[PDB]
Ligand binder design. Structure first.
Ligand SMILES: CCN(CC)c1ccc2c(c1)Oc1cc(N(CC)CC)ccc1C2c1ccccc1C(=O)OCCOCCOCCn1cc(CO[C@@H]2O[C@@H](C)[C@@H](O)[C@@H](O)[C@@H]2O)nn1
Ligand SMILES: CCN(CC)c1ccc2c(c1)Oc1cc(N(CC)CC)ccc1C2c1ccccc1C(=O)OCCOCCOCCn1cc(CO[C@@H]2O[C@@H](C)[C@@H](O)[C@@H](O)[C@@H]2O)nn1
Ligand SMILES: CCN(CC)c1ccc2c(c1)Oc1cc(N(CC)CC)ccc1C2c1ccccc1C(=O)OCCOCCOCCn1cc(CO[C@@H]2O[C@@H](C)[C@@H](O)[C@@H](O)[C@@H]2O)nn1
Length: 259
């Protein structure tokens, strides 16, 4: 089945969804007025994405992997350009602040490792754990980053936590996952594709529970945004070459307009 990655920004919001299909990654875009085809078109069997705003200006980083080679592509308002990133493998990316800092996790032959950017060159991070699949989400509390990495082997997903004092195993209870988070509590939703079905586990600070989302798919991606205190979630569920968007806007899961 095709494999997707999603990011979003602002409160409209804008959404970009990257799809890897038969070794090519293409882009579909939403800015409030209909889906359209974006400019990005590069080779890849696997894709991940992160983005950040500086004022009103979006910066996008797309990580495109063939075999064991990952290429970073950069959008900074003036066309796509190849980025400095160095380390098919499967990646997950997150970013924070306006520098920004970036962490890119790679699953390669049953091991996940980490490459980091803080504005002064790529380096190897401390994270090194078993896994065939990886997803990540992060949030800031002031200047302090918190990272959650979901590492899966077979049907077992292990959560790994960075909270400024080393990687520790988290309370979360191969399958493929996607994760998003919001606020400073925070809330976290983790989607898992297992045997053609996507299910949802949720944290709001008081234990993991099963969420309401339950839809068909072999691959999943997710993005979310706040409008005030209200969370909005978009889950992209793929079977074969068909991707279905599922929308949570506080009143149940509804199918979205994505094509
Ligand atoms: C922090 C807020 N923004 C948003 C507009 C910003 C500001 C300045 C630049 C920015 C962005 O981006 C670049 C990008 C390049 N490129 C094109 C992508 C080279 C490939 C070159 C310069 C800037 C400069 C630049 C302009 C003038 C003066 C300063 C600096 C400077 O960043 O630095 C402040 C700290 O000391 C100077 C370091 O600047 C050179 C080293 N470098 C590369 C990058 C950008 O690299 C890319 O983006 C990353 C976030 C990673 O994804 C990389 O792998 C990727 O290659 N930022 N700094
Ligand atoms: C007896 C258990 N309770 C009662 C709820 C408790 C325990 C610690 C604090 C508690 C409460 O409350 C506060 C309140 C504040 N304030 C008041 C000014 C502002 C919010 C500040 C600090 C505390 C702390 C505190 C004191 C010292 C050191 C740390 C922490 C800390 O926040 O959490 C540390 C984590 O373990 C103990 C916390 O117990 C609550 C249950 N739990 C687990 C997690 C974190 O779990 C991980 O991160 C998640 C986001 C998920 O990824 C998890 O799967 C993962 O395991 N947070 N709460
Ligand atoms: C011409 C009359 N028709 C049908 C022929 C109509 C009218 C209103 C809606 C319609 C359809 O459909 C939906 C569908 C959704 N879903 C599934 C039920 C996903 C959330 C949600 C809303 C509608 C609304 C709706 C309800 C409440 C608020 C707004 C909107 C809204 O869309 O606009 C109607 C008035 O114009 C406001 C400007 O927006 C027009 C087009 N539009 C769609 C959206 C929301 O679209 C969704 O969220 C996005 C961020 C993307 O993820 C989408 O792909 C997703 O469909 N915002 N604007």
């Amino acid at each position: 089945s095709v494999q997707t990655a999603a990011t979003s920004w602002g409160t409209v919001p804008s959404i970009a969804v990257y799809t890897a299909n038969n070794g090519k990654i293409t882009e579909r875009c939403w800015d409030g007025k209909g889906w359209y085809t974006g400019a990005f078109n590069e080779p890849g069997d696997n894709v991940s994405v992160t983005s950040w705003l500086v004022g009103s200006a979006i910066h996008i980083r797309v990580y495109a992997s063939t075999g064991t080679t990952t290429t970073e592509w950069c959008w900074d308002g003036n066309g796509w350009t190849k980025g400095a990133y160095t380390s098919g493998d499967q990646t997950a990316a997150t970013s924070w602040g306006t520098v920004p800092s970036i962490a890119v996790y790679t699953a390669n032959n049953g091991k996940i490792t980490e490459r980091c950017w803080d504005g002064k060159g790529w380096y190897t991070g401390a994270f090194n754990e078993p896994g065939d699949n990886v997803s990540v989400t992060s949030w800031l509390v002031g200047s302090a980053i918190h990272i959650r990495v979901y590492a899966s082997t077979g049907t077992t997903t292990t959560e790994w936590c960075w909270d400024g004092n080393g990687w520790t195993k988290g309370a979360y209870t191969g399958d493929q996952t996607a994760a998003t988070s919001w606020g400073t509590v925070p809330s976290i939703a983790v989607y898992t594709a297992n045997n053609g079905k996507i299910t949802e586990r949720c944290w709001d600070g008081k234990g993991w529970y099963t969420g309401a989302f339950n839809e068909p798919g072999d691959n999943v991606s997710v993005t979310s945004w706040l409008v005030g205190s209200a969370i909005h979630i978009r889950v992209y569920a793929s079977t074969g070459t068909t991707t279905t968007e599922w929308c949570w806007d506080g009143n149940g899961w509804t199918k979205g307009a994505y094509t």
